[model samples]
Target: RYDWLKTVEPTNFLKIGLPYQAHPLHLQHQATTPPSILEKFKRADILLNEVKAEMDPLMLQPETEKKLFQILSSIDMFKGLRKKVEFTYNAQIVTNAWLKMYELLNTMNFNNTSQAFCNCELPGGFISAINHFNYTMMHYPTFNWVASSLYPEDHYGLYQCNPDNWLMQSPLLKKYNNGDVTIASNVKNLALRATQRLTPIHLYTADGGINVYNKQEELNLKLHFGQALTGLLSLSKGGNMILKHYTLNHAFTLSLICVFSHFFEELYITKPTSSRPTNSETYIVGKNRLRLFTPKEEQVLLKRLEFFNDTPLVDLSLYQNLLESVYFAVETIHLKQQIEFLNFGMKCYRHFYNKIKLLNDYLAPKKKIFQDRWRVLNKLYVLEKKHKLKLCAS
Candidate 1:
């Protein structure tokens, strides 16, 4: 069904096994930050964090605003990069960072005119993808993108970039977005309730979290995994999906993947280079969706998710062999990466115990893969566009 699936002639592309595909451009461009940009970005990251630390406690206090004035006075050039166009202050550097990271995933095989549905609308993830589609293509994409952000909890939770401001603040959206974009605050029960407010769409971009500082994170992962699956209820036939998960080591998640396998033609477990090796996150991309539940089927699936939420893998008798399934190869790769990161950390612990390495250096190597992949994919997009080739899977 794709150029890779049936090639008539010889090609340089590597032949990979099923459930896995090589990163498209594999090492085409450099993603490392130049020293100057790295300094600024590091400065910005700290300031954003500091601002958030104060976000909940000292929001409107006089000292808080004064702290900003003190810091902003010393660090950056008075007019930053955004001044190149309309005196617009540069927007969402941190948020835009993930757009580059998203580009690293195998999610770009989307239909150009895709009707996009993003489950977690905050953190600028949806528009970040939207911005990528347009920025590289100059708003030339025929995509009709729809996004939903959880209202007001986002308003206070992370104070760095109030997501509500994305539409009005980003130059990317302002310049490229036609009326084809739809972003609104909607009710946020992804599993318990249906997202009937949204029409069936071609794709689901779901974002999740894993701050297990408290023990409740298990129950949280349980509910959230169901929410991620619930997106299937709202997707169109043959739709594609991208989900962010912390890890796949548990039965609750592995079991859901088995269930998801029934509905998707292809499922690839991806750990993009941009995501830190120390972080247990991985993405599962499903292609060519098939419909399943609404009333009875959905109720059954949700019941299954809830049951496994608390049950130990040892407790299950019927599905005992699940831990040794199709996803194991990719699963082992992720586990090994984490182990590698552990050794590297301890390798650095010797030097850093005194004073040494910075993580900024660590990200540079990974970021290059992301930046290059975006470059090459966008080139293909333009070529296909000019030739009037089929960009839409439809």
Candidate 2:
């Protein structure tokens, strides 16, 4: 009976959208009910104040409300805790797959190499080998909350909380408590902006207190930092590495897929999911570093996936399968020594940014500074090795 209501069909409200786009209204209509014949047509709204109070004791902030209009934005932002875990996993896979392809190609053409294409490896093959995704993500983003806040009652989650509460345990806390807010405030602000820069993989940070106030400064700082970092890396050996091997065009493309996988994995697995007290569904699926597959199991999974290798290739844009997109991305960008170093550059950027934020927060002294510089030093070594390979092949 209403003009506006008459125009919107159930199908119109039930459509779904891409992970980063607004969820279509068509999906919303899937939950709609048919109008009652016994009652005259009238607008219907159900609000149980008590239910809402019980469900959301702390109402969404005005900004949270504005952002909620799109799940893409929400995932873009918080993505809860579980989504962050998933993003770390995707990065592990893409990075690993790229590494494996390098090994396969090296073995296949042991003697065949162009003067420029020799000795280059993807960055992080070794660093990544040393780092664990779960170990890192758990420490940042209000790490203390993970224990009971995100998971069931357990020591695994409890163990993840900082043994030393940054604000209370350290003497620096007392000094900062009385003196300056910028240190604490900027630290949190940077964390928020950093999370958005690459999605879930980089979600948490050492300073979780910034979880709340870290948006504005984070954005401005990221713009300033991103351009500076990219520009700096582009000029360095690492930048030349990606350029000579991966090239900017393919690097730009694959980087988007890597970024998209980070976001979409969160939406598909965690959000729109809930658990009950008795259901045991809340138990952390990845807890204790329990992955979806063992290394041997992953080998099996990889073999199964190879079946798709022989199939005819198709356009990645329209079909949008991540595995295929990843395969094509690898093939498009020739793997080289420089690409490996570029990986190191990215890892260094992340580690430096993270440690610098810690420094800004007065978390630790100059040790992180040394660590950051050393990462760059090792990256330079990777560049040297690549050049040696080129000379030997030539």
Candidate 3:
């Protein structure tokens, strides 16, 4: 063997960080964390007292409801041949969101040979859309759909995709998902942050991105949106895509939208009517990707992401047309109410999360004695079987 071959070692490629003074400019530790149970024996008292600072939310809501809807005004950005259909969460949890999509664009146009990717809407709201449209793969086998389900809900994977086109019957194979699994919270890292903002439940719910309160928050939030573009790398040219986004105000954040603008024939910033106007959450639908990302584009993205300061990874000046398109989509259509909601200034104290989590820990098994735990998803066959079983019991 050559001596050069023996000289090699694995490349962990560690790097040294820059030096800076430990104290002064910003005193607050930053990062948003989802609410979690305080351990039963310890820290619960401190955490409980900590939560008392934020307010109760139920005291407000109603005219709170109409704050945003009135401004949707005359803009029907998604005018199409698709009509609306009402669906129940008992049947399909994400059914309503997809129906709004179909009402905006004909999602069930089979024989067109389409591939769709899903990230935010779990369990293929697209699947729910198809069953309602009633197209069989036997007659038109060209349509292929894939989903990113990172939860226990993967129990119904068999019903989510075709066997041959199947990515498999469980959790959609974490590899196919477009998000980085960088989620974390800890003693010094999490509970400490909780004392000030009080870890929010919004992290678990639909509105995971609730404006970055600090530099750590910015990095964590951008990390998610940046990785979410990972789905685009898998999507085919001329295919459709959907993803969830929050607060697309920064140059870095809005730059990601421009990335979509260049790739897709049309990009729509939409918020399905069913969602709350109070949250900064919104959906970006990219129809007909012009092409996949080029090696140069990914290189640009990777370089930009390596560092952060609200500056874009791509040259914003070069994308002036796309910049305007995204600006027009947001300012004229989206921001009218987004600013209104931000101004709505409703004090959404997530500290209330403590109340529910505490009760859940103490009362779940107590309630379990009185109520049968509802297991399994609400897939049609499962529902029908339960309907019959309950009928027989009656």
Candidate 4:
């Protein structure tokens, strides 16, 4: 065991450290560990001097090295949570909250909508926009969910040699590197402002490659993207809203969730879960094409969820309301016959209607409320068809 530990890929440190950074169980343990005991691990430090000398220069750039040190030095940021009893109690609370959140994801029908709108045409219609949304936002995130479930390999563990190789795969980092101004500015701000709560493990590979698995950088991305979403939400409603702004806003939300779910695994797993379902094949069928269940199947699925009992209904309500507002804005723009807005409205409608369906069972007597809304949407669809036919006849 110690032999592999001796030769453990420097990047494996990143994988091992991830548990402490995100999981409540590991963080709580760290909070309880006495500083005197922690000091020994720091001194012995799993990666010995020879490995460091061999890997550091290969893996780290001069600037990257500087940022890593700064992040490591800032580890005192979270030094206050050390009370044995209180910390333990709070850790348990966090653990439960995380679990409940995962349960909520499982119970919802996110997968159904994730790829439901994709159509493989020449890609010049409003339907094409929906297809792209489903692909980028829904499908990629949901694909990760299925991949994580099916292939539970820990390659990021002790088996890796170059950690920067993994960082290179990050879309966020790639965008920043390519001079995407918006991502670069936001990422830079994230680096400056995010609290460095861990003594980030920094190492270089034998070939002078450096990988700084900076927790602050990770948190910064999440926080800034989350901030972007809040900003989108705060944009004035109705005539003040720009169609382009709303379009990019939802696109960004879905993109952020896709990347963020890697760190927070519970973000994608839906109810009955992938493994426990009686018909796992049906879930897998949606991988290539859009999958929607019959009304009977949907009701069965909805009833399987104890959304009221297990989900944090308040948060769900807030998310639903926000999506509904975005849909309303899209609908207003689409009513003017702008093709782009029509595409946006159609996709937004699908996502919005999906949320209502999820909430319908819990809303009790209010179920008819969404049904009435659906009827109006049906009328609009019919009107659009009639208009299109009139245009063709002309």
For all candidates, the clash counts are: 1, 19, 0, 16
TM-score of each: 0.55, 0.18, 0.47, 0.16
lDDT score of residue 322 within candidate 3:
51
| Tens-digit lDDT track of model 3 for 117-174 | 3333344454444333323222233334433333344333433433332222244454
User: lDDT for every model?
Assistant: 0.42, 0.22, 0.36, 0.22
TM-score of 3: 0.47
Could you tell me how far off, in angstroms, the CA of residue 378 lies in candidate 4 after the best superposition? 45
320 in model 4: Cα distance from truth in Å?
Answer: 13
- Residue 331 lDDT, candidate 4, scale 0-100: 30
Q: Choose the strongest candidate by lDDT.
A: 1
TM-score of candidate 2 against the unseen true structure: 0.18
What's the true lDDT of residue 341 in model 2? 26
Q: List runs of model 1 lying over 4 Å from the truth.
A: 1-97, 104-108, 134-142, 149-198, 213-219, 303-308, 312-331, 357-394
Worst window of 10 by summed lDDT in candidate 1: 178-187
Off by over 4 Å in 4: 1-66, 72-394
Tens digit of per-residue lDDT, candidate 2, span 178-291: 111123332232223333332222111110011221122232222222221221111212111111111112222222222223222221111011111001010000101111
Candidate 3: regions farther than 4 A off: 1-91, 94-96, 104-113, 120-123, 130-142, 151-220, 299-310, 338-394
Name model 2 segments beyond 4 Å from true: 1-18, 21-172, 177-274, 277-394
